[PDB]
Amino acid sequence: PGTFFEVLKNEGVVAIATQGEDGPHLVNTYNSYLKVLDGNRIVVPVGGMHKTEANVARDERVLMTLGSRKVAGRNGPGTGFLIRGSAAFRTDGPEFEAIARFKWARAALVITVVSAEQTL
Ligand X SMILES: Cc1cc2nc3c(=O)[nH]c(=O)nc-3n(C[C@H](O)[C@H](O)[C@H](O)COP(=O)(O)O)c2cc1C
Residues lying near a second copy in the complex (CB under 8 A): 12-13, 15, 17-19, 23-28, 59, 61, 63-65, 67, 80, 82, 119-120
Print the binding letters for residues 45-84 with ligand X: x by CB under 6 A, - otherwise.
Answer: xxxxxxxx--------------x------------x----
Backbone φ and ψ for 44, nearest 5 degrees, come out as -120, 135
* CA 105 – CA 48 distance, rounded (Å): 8
* CA 115 – CA 61 distance, rounded (Å): 12
Q: Residue 102's closest CA among 25, 26, 39, 30?
A: 30
Using CB distances below 5 to 8 A depending on partner kind, what does residue 63 bind out of a second copy, ligand X, none? a second copy
Using CB distances below 5 to 8 A depending on partner kind, what does residue 9 bind out of ligand X, a second copy, none? none
**Which one of the spans 4-12, 27-35, 56-64, 86-94 is the region binding ligand X (CB under 6 A)?**
27-35
Using CB distances below 5 to 8 A depending on partner kind, what does residue 109 bind out of a second copy, ligand X, none? none
- Angstrom distances, CA of residue 107 to CA of 62, 74, 95: 17, 35, 9
Q: Residue 83's closest CA among 95, 70, 98, 67?
A: 67
For ligand X, the binding residues (CB under 6 A) are 13, 25, 27-30, 33, 45-52, 67, 80, 119-120
